[PDB]
Design a protein around this ligand. Structure first.
Ligand SMILES: *[C@@H]1O[C@H](CO)[C@@H](O[C@@H]2O[C@H](CO)[C@@H](O[C@@H]3O[C@H](CO)[C@@H](O)[C@H](O[C@H]4O[C@H](CO)[C@@H](O)[C@H](O)[C@@H]4O)[C@@H]3O)[C@H](O)[C@H]2NC(C)=O)[C@H](O)[C@H]1NC(C)=O
Ligand SMILES: Nc1nc2c(ncn2[C@@H]2O[C@H](COP(=O)(O)O[C@H]3[C@@H](O)[C@H](n4ccc(=O)[nH]c4=O)O[C@@H]3COP(=O)(O)O)[C@H]3OP(=O)(O)O[C@H]32)c(=O)[nH]1
Ligand SMILES: Nc1nc2c(ncn2[C@@H]2O[C@H](COP(=O)(O)O[C@H]3[C@@H](O)[C@H](n4ccc(=O)[nH]c4=O)O[C@@H]3COP(=O)(O)O)[C@H]3OP(=O)(O)O[C@H]32)c(=O)[nH]1
Ligand SMILES: *[C@@H]1O[C@H](CO)[C@@H](O[C@@H]2O[C@H](CO)[C@@H](O[C@@H]3O[C@H](CO)[C@@H](O)[C@H](O)[C@@H]3O)[C@H](O)[C@H]2NC(C)=O)[C@H](O)[C@H]1NC(C)=O
Ligand SMILES: *[C@@H]1O[C@H](CO)[C@@H](O[C@@H]2O[C@H](CO)[C@@H](O[C@@H]3O[C@H](CO)[C@@H](O)[C@H](O)[C@@H]3O)[C@H](O)[C@H]2NC(C)=O)[C@H](O)[C@H]1NC(C)=O
Ligand SMILES: *[C@@H]1O[C@H](CO)[C@@H](O[C@@H]2O[C@H](CO)[C@@H](O[C@@H]3O[C@H](CO)[C@@H](O)[C@H](O)[C@@H]3O)[C@H](O)[C@H]2NC(C)=O)[C@H](O)[C@H]1NC(C)=O
Ligand SMILES: *[C@@H]1O[C@H](CO)[C@@H](O[C@@H]2O[C@H](CO)[C@@H](O)[C@H](O)[C@H]2NC(C)=O)[C@H](O)[C@H]1NC(C)=O
Ligand SMILES: *[C@@H]1O[C@H](CO)[C@@H](O[C@@H]2O[C@H](CO)[C@@H](O)[C@H](O)[C@H]2NC(C)=O)[C@H](O)[C@H]1NC(C)=O
Ligand SMILES: O=c1ccn([C@@H]2O[C@H](CO)[C@@H](O)[C@H]2O)c(=O)[nH]1
Ligand SMILES: O=c1ccn([C@@H]2O[C@H](CO)[C@@H](O)[C@H]2O)c(=O)[nH]1
Ligand SMILES: *[C@@H]1O[C@H](CO)[C@@H](O)[C@H](O)[C@H]1NC(C)=O
Ligand SMILES: *[C@@H]1O[C@H](CO)[C@@H](O)[C@H](O)[C@H]1NC(C)=O
Ligand SMILES: *[C@@H]1O[C@H](CO)[C@@H](O)[C@H](O)[C@H]1NC(C)=O
Ligand SMILES: *[C@@H]1O[C@H](CO)[C@@H](O)[C@H](O)[C@H]1NC(C)=O
Ligand SMILES: *[C@@H]1O[C@H](CO)[C@@H](O)[C@H](O)[C@H]1NC(C)=O
Ligand SMILES: *[C@@H]1O[C@H](CO)[C@@H](O)[C@H](O)[C@H]1NC(C)=O
Ligand SMILES: *[C@@H]1O[C@H](CO)[C@@H](O)[C@H](O)[C@H]1NC(C)=O
Ligand SMILES: *[C@@H]1O[C@H](CO)[C@@H](O)[C@H](O)[C@H]1NC(C)=O
Ligand SMILES: *[C@@H]1O[C@H](CO)[C@@H](O)[C@H](O)[C@H]1NC(C)=O
Ligand SMILES: *[C@@H]1O[C@H](CO)[C@@H](O)[C@H](O)[C@H]1NC(C)=O
Lengths: 747, 738
């Protein structure tokens, strides 16, 4: 049983409050992650017993001044390939690094000198990350790059120098380079010589040089006069393998078509945060890009300007390989059919993104004229009836999550109208739309009574997101025009459910033939009109967290005692966050016998009637985390043969009953973290049967570390197939000499 | 030093996990509150010490087996006036109650038998509370009322029997009654005899008998065929003093005017949850209410019906004393000027409540022609561009003020909250009166305010725009409101979250008289062009729930002076800003005028205490709920103004030397829920220490000594100042020892 790391050859040793490199790491280990510890010193002794190490991660030590690394500390590790030293306040590149390194990352340090002595003997480097050493209003020096320092790195494939003050492209780069990142480097001019020999390059990032600074979310310094980056006509002429070009925030007003003349493979062009309204309308460069797949022209708005219409050049029609066009933040009032003519015959154009344009009106019928749209993204418009802020490993100019949740988009064509002002759906709201399978109307403040006709023009919606609205459930036929509906999200429509005196009709649920997943979370449901029961022959999953079952199941009221019973196909039920202090026995028995997964976490349960598990023969997962439970039954196997996972974290359990660990044969994963256990007695340990337990969680219990723990420790020694994670957090509260130590580190 | 109660003569002893009546109560106590403890038995031994007890509260024992009370347990208490025994699962009225009692509460027990033996001996009773013993689907017995059980209570002024099954008004009630509460008692018939003797009654509650059960939020049983309650023509004949009549939810469709004939002082008439749409339209009874001040006709809607217009009888014009009219939940589409004609000459009608009517359109100009409207309440419409019920509250409606008092104090108030005014068009507020208090909360207003939207009502002083989604793209926003004093912009996160759109807060500087600004829960992390908040007038800024962790990031200097230009500021709230550290320069740039600084519920591990030298008026500093690991030993050096220092929920381990005994303006220090195991060996007036893990060895005697010598330093909740060690002492207050 490894300690302090979890081994599996990989050693997960991160975030463990470690103060030095442990001398206890399995000597077979090949990758070791010690990130986020409190390590302050690395010497030639730190890794002495571990010469099979391929990979070391030391990022973010010491985690709350800097990591002190001796010359040659690593130089004896002969197989070391990957060394991660991010966010360690290093004042220099460490001296005497091993020649074997293929990957070195020094992101987010204080290194202002890149020197031959540091780097040049690292002949095997493929990827070198030096970004984010001097930037914004950090107090730091201009980066000195020693002439020719990278010239000997003849296998170098990726070099990243972004977010440092460089002023010029470094000369003498190796022609092995595939990816060169030079974002936010204060380079104002790109000469013909700068990228001259780089015939293998596939990615060039020159974003944030001569930035567009209006409304910047960071301290931003424009080029004089807010001028554009100055890229020589021939700067790209030998970049024949280029696939990705990032020119975001280079204050461009003109794009020279001749930049692309030798660039037949360009697939992704990023031109966000420039001043390209004119070029978008004229667009001579568009001719050069018939193989482009992604064009991002987001946030090129003219500030203060809110024109009626977007002006797209007819030459967009040349972008014959286009798959996604991103046009956030152009900012305009109205989208008319004619305005997108140029895009309508593009054969592979799957995605159109018009997020964040403050658009007031759209002629929806225009989307039908497109060849092949799968994603119509119109969120955030005005349609109506550690202790650094930026992730160095992520795109700086846009978020890279999918525009549509994958689970919704998997059904078919997607229309996302979230975060607009469609406060009711009128009779003709969805006229002349493609055949939408995936519809997002989240956060429109929709207060309407859905009545069974609102979705008639798009009747094959299968995944409907209506979260964060204020729907008035006064009509039992609501949404029944959607016969194929499979997923329905009604989360955060509490507005009218909170009001006792208006009607709340949920009867429509029963009308769906194919409804599989229903989310009613965070609605504050405490009262329903006429019918008190939810019923469906199809429903598999009901999320009912964040409601008031404490009131629906009050002891003085019988009406809701069968509320979920009529959900006869149900396998997953979430009753978390319902302020439950007790469940009446009859209510529990009325939960569907079909269940396999039951969550009642984050309530206030003082007691749980285990005997009632007899009625749930298919029940695999029972989640009671975050309650106030005091005891377990001492004959749990009498009550279930199906239970595979039992989660009891964050309760007030102080005693295990005899045999409990091995009571139940089906039980693989028992979570007793953060309870009130002082020991586990031999009594809890006696079985006649082989335990099938695979994971037992125990961190955060106030263990009593005296001789009375020895039985449990031997049990541990005798059942290594039972994984106990976070041994470093399985801690003695007592006695004094033991307090804070892992129960494992005692004699 | 009292224990276990706090005494002040009143002993507050509630909610302290007490398992018996404590024997160490001040012998001089007149009022003892023992509510919410874990007490299971009372005996005539329980209170022996205490004979000048005038009042006992034993509500909610034992808390979370009834309270077992022996006969005559209370009998040797000669001054006991008032006994509270709510929510104790009592199976009977207890035997042997002292005859001194003027007030008895047995609300929320299991008592189904009201007998001479419990009650008839209690001759001084003014107030008797028997409500909520059998109701809803509780398992309980019909309520047996022993014939003439109240006949002897000839001082009795208030009798409450609500929420029990009674079936009949009990006969032989004393004519000393003022208030008779019989709500939800399953009484279907009110006979000419039922209120015989009761010529001094001023209140009668007959609500919930023959209830209107459609959409009930409780188990509701209608009378046969949902018939109305049956009230005899002459049943109110001799109820000449009535001021308050509650007939809510009695399924009335027809009101007999003659019921009010001899009741010309009726002030408050509650008719909610009936079927009175026809009566409201025609209503002869409205002609018999010359002195009525409050009429509540709420939730009389006909289900499924959504008429165009509300139909208000001309006879409303005879309600000459009306001050408030409640018409929630009539449910109608449109309010036209002429529809309120009959109200327009009532000289004292100050409040009109049309909440929850799903009203789509209103002609605002009609309000102009009323006599004296001060509260126009239109919240929750469709305008566009462990028992659940508190036994001491009204059951049919909330009783909080319609408008926050701090807003209404400014003058005429218009509440449009919880509608769909997602933008304010150019004539939205035309023909309104001179509105001073305006509520537009929760309209999902997404608009760019530009300085003209409130031109028609330019004297607004208190503007509530919370829970909207305002787009701050214009420096002139709201500047037409020259007199504005209070602006609430809480919960307008929507656009502030988005980096790429503009966020302009420059308009704040343009107000001469702005006193209070609440920017809470806006997630503010980036602003456009001007990085600083400026105002010569502003006194209080609430900035909680924003991202000062980002605004003051070490790598960015732009917001280091964000609040400095708030030159008049005395109160600043920076709680819930995810702060791990505040840059020293940022702290020093907070206004030197501050008297009150909150930075609670962040994640601060360090505080630079020396910086308090630049805050010479600072009286209150709140650092609760951070991760502070130690205190300065030099506090006297950095402030002579601090009176209150709140440090609860932090990680402090050691009180430094001479902290307490050192200076001086410091009245209140809160160190509760920290990590102190001891305190080692002065206007200080209060010292909180509950929830520390005190080591209760002999090392602790000095502190106890010190406690004994400084009895002018209150230490609240001594029962919660607990030893965590040693194992013997664990769970004990620190006041038990050698
Ligand atoms: C300018 O545009 C260029 C080209 O589009 C863009 O290049 C991309 O940069 C991002 C960010 O560094 C790269 O994405 C990373 O790449 C590797 C995958 O090989 C991953 O290790 C990273 O994932 C980790 O980090 C993510 C964020 O913390 C985690 O969410 C994830 O779970 C991983 O832990 C990450 O995805 C991307 O590879 C390149 N693109 C290409 C084609 O090389 C560049 O970022 C733009 N410039 C700026 C300043 O925005
Ligand atoms: N470029 C961009 N992308 C955005 C934006 N908002 C959301 N996204 C999403 O980020 C995700 C990442 O896009 P990004 O352009 O940064 O990077 C792409 C593209 O650069 C590139 N790519 C992607 C698709 C393609 O056909 N050809 C191609 O070269 O490969 C990256 C991996 O992303 P993936 O498509 O696998 O999720 C995309 O997923 P999505 O289709 O839902 O939309 C994109 C946005 O404003 N701009
Ligand atoms: N009746 C009624 N009142 C409601 C409703 N919604 C909110 N309220 C508020 O509860 C509060 C209590 O009103 P309620 O009718 O229940 O009882 C009044 C009235 O019964 C009575 N009263 C009050 C004022 C008066 O002039 N004459 C009068 O007889 O004294 C009670 C206490 O009022 P308070 O001491 O808080 O000022 C009111 O304050 P508000 O003017 O803003 O409106 C009332 C509602 O739907 N119905
Ligand atoms: C309302 O409830 C639904 C149903 O629970 C929520 O959608 C579900 O969310 C979970 C994420 O918690 C998804 O499961 C996850 O899927 C990913 C991707 O496959 C997987 O990697 C994770 O391990 C996890 O299993 C689940 O797929 C998804 N279901 C559907 C139909 O989309 C929804 O998010 C809730 N809505 C709100 C606003 O909370
Ligand atoms: C029917 O209508 C009448 C109004 O005439 C309601 O009477 C009011 O009842 C409330 C709530 O019980 C009383 O308030 C309480 O008063 C005490 C004593 O002052 C106070 O300590 C409590 O905190 C609480 O405010 C109120 O006094 C009483 N009004 C009068 C004039 O006596 C009655 O509640 C209604 N019935 C139902 C079932 O709602
Ligand atoms: C936005 O911030 C304002 C200013 O803090 C909040 O209004 C203020 O709320 C406090 C209570 O949180 C009011 O003080 C209280 O007054 C009552 C009545 O006198 C008193 O009983 C309390 O002990 C306390 O003093 C304060 O008067 C009030 N200020 C104003 C101008 O109304 C407001 O609630 C915050 N908005 C939101 C949505 O949270
Ligand atoms: C519908 O749109 C809403 C709003 O854009 C989406 O909610 C966002 O979802 C992402 C992905 O999980 C979260 O990280 C964001 O925080 C959400 N934002 C808000 C404001 O809620 C929602 O995911 C979309 N629905 C579908 C099915 O794609
Ligand atoms: C403006 O209207 C809102 C919504 O009606 C009021 O907010 C309510 O205030 C009460 C009193 O504090 C709270 O208990 C309710 O929970 C609030 N409801 C919601 C939905 O926020 C607000 O008080 C009103 N503003 C003024 C100035 O009176
Ligand atoms: O409702 C609108 C309309 C337009 N803009 C413009 O959009 C850009 C980004 O906020 C700015 O130029 C701003 O003027 C808005 O912000 N909000
Ligand atoms: O938008 C509306 C319009 C009317 N109603 C009606 O209002 C009463 C209370 O909800 C019910 O009869 C219902 O029919 C609504 O609920 N919502
Ligand atoms: C780092 O620790 C070493 C011992 O290995 C010590 O000699 C040296 O002074 C330290 N370096 C710094 C920069 O403090
Ligand atoms: C592009 O679309 C056409 C259909 O017009 C199809 O033939 C081709 O396979 C698609 N190409 C890609 C790469 O999807
Ligand atoms: C729902 O609305 C439809 C369409 O307006 C209407 O015909 C029907 O009567 C309503 N259904 C119910 C149950 O009221
Ligand atoms: C919904 O189901 C119920 C009961 O099965 C049926 O009465 C009703 O007509 C169905 N409604 C619709 C609109 O299909
Ligand atoms: C029960 O659930 C599954 C969904 O996985 C579905 O295939 C089956 O059709 C459902 N039963 C009914 C009656 O719809
Ligand atoms: C109106 O109220 C005033 C003062 O509140 C009072 O003098 C007068 O009697 C009331 N008028 C009527 C018609 O009741
Ligand atoms: C605010 O909007 C008004 C009305 O459109 C306009 O006159 C003005 O230019 C805007 N003000 C600012 C400061 O941009
Ligand atoms: C607001 O204040 C500033 C100067 O303090 C001034 O420039 C601006 O014109 C004022 N705005 C208006 C609308 O008065
Ligand atoms: C400062 O605040 C007080 C209100 O508390 C006010 O009397 C004074 O006018 C304010 N100062 C200025 C210059 O407005
Ligand atoms: C307190 O702040 C000042 C800077 O304003 C500095 O002189 C002193 O070092 C600070 N103390 C700490 C602990 O940073």
């Amino acid at each position: 049983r490894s300690y302090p790391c979890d081994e599996k050859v990989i050693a997960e040793c991160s975030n463990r409050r470690l103060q030095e490199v442990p001398q206890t790491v399995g000597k077979y280990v090949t990758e070791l992650d010690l990130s986020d510890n409190f390590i302050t010193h690395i010497t030639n002794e730190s890794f002495q017993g571990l010469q099979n190490l391929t990979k070391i991660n030391l990022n973010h030590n010491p985690n709350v001044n800097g990591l002190n690394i001796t010359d040659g500390a690593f130089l004896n590790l002969k197989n070391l390939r990957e060394l991660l030293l991010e966010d360690n306040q290093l004042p220099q590149i460490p001296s005497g690094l091993p020649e074997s390194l293929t990957e070195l990352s020094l992101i987010q340090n204080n290194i202002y000198n890149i020197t031959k002595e540091g780097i040049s003997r690292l002949i095997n480097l493929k990827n070198l990350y030096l970004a984010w050493n001097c930037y914004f209003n950090k107090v730091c020096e201009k980066t000195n790059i020693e002439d020719g320092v990278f010239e000997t790195l003849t296998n170098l494939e990726l070099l990243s120098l972004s977010f440092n003050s460089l002023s010029h492209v470094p000369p003498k780069l190796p022609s092995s380079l595939r990816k060169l990142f030079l974002s936010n480097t204060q380079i104002k001019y790109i000469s013909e010589e700068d990228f001259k020999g780089l015939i293998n390059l596939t990615l060039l990032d020159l974003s944030g040089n001569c930035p567009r600074c209006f409304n910047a979310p960071f301290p931003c310094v424009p080029c004089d006069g807010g001028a554009s980056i100055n890229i020589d006509r021939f700067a790209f002429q030998n970049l024949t393998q280029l696939r990705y070009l990032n020119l975001s925030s280079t204050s461009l007003r003109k794009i020279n078509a001749a930049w692309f003349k030798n660039m037949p493979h360009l697939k992704v062009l990023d031109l966000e945060f420039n001043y390209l309204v004119g070029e978008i309308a004229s667009g001579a460069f568009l001719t050069m890009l018939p193989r482009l797949e992604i064009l991002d022209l987001s946030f090129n708005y003219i500030k203060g300007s809110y024109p009626q219409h977007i002006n797209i050049s007819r030459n967009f029609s040349k972008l014959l390989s286009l798959r996604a066009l991103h046009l956030r933040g152009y900012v305009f009032q109205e989208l008319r059919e004619d305005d997108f003519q140029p895009l309508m015959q593009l054969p592979n154009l799957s995605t159109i993104n018009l997020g964040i344009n403050f658009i007031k009106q759209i002629d929806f019928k225009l989307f039908q004229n497109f060849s092949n749209l799968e994603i119509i993204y119109l969120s955030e418009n005005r349609i109506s009836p550690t202790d650094f802020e930026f992730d160095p490993h992520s795109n700086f100019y846009h978020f890279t999550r999918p525009l549509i949740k994958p689970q919704c988009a998997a059904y078919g064509k997607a229309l996302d109208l979230s975060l607009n002002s469609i406060f009711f759906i009128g009779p003709n709201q969805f006229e002349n739309l493609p055949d939408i399978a995936c519809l997002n109307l989240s956060a429109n403040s929709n207060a309407q009574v859905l009545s069974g006709t609102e979705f008639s023009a798009i009747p094959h919606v299968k995944y409907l997101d209506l979260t964060n609205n204020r729907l008035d459930f006064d009509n039992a036929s609501a949404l029944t025009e959607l016969s194929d509906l499979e997923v329905l999200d009604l989360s955060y429509n509490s507005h009218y459910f909170r009001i006792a005196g208006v009607t709340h009709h949920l009867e429509f649920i029963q009308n769906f033939t194919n409804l599989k997943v229903l989310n009613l979370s965070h609605n504050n449901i405490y009262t329903l009109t006429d019918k008190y029961n939810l019923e469906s022959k199809s429903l598999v999953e009901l999320v009912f967290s964040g409601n008031r079952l404490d009131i629906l199941w009050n002891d003085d009221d019988n009406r809701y005692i069968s509320i979920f019973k009529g959900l006869k196909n149900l396998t997953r039920l979430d009753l978390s966050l319902n302020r439950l202090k007790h469940i009446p026995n009859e209510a529990f028995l009325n939960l569907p016998a079909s269940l396999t997964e039951l969550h009642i976490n984050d309530n206030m349960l003082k007691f749980f009637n285990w005997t009632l598990l007899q009625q749930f023969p298919r029940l695999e997962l029972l989640d009671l985390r975050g309650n106030k439970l005091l005891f377990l039954t001492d004959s749990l196997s009498d009550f279930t043969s199906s239970l595979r996972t039992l989660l009891l974290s964050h309760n007030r359990i102080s005693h295990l009953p005899s045999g409990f660990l091995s009571e139940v044969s089906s039980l693989k994963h028992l979570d007793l973290s953060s309870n009130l256990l002082k020991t586990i007695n031999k009594s809890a340990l006696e079985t006649k049967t082989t335990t099938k337990l695979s994971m037992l969680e125990l961190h955060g219990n106030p263990f009593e570390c005296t001789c009375d723990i020895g039985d449990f420790r031997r049990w541990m020694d005798e059942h290594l197939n039972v994984k106990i994670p976070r041994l470093v957090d399985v801690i003695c509260a007592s006695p004094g000499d033991q307090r804070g130590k892992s129960i494992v580190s005692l004699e």
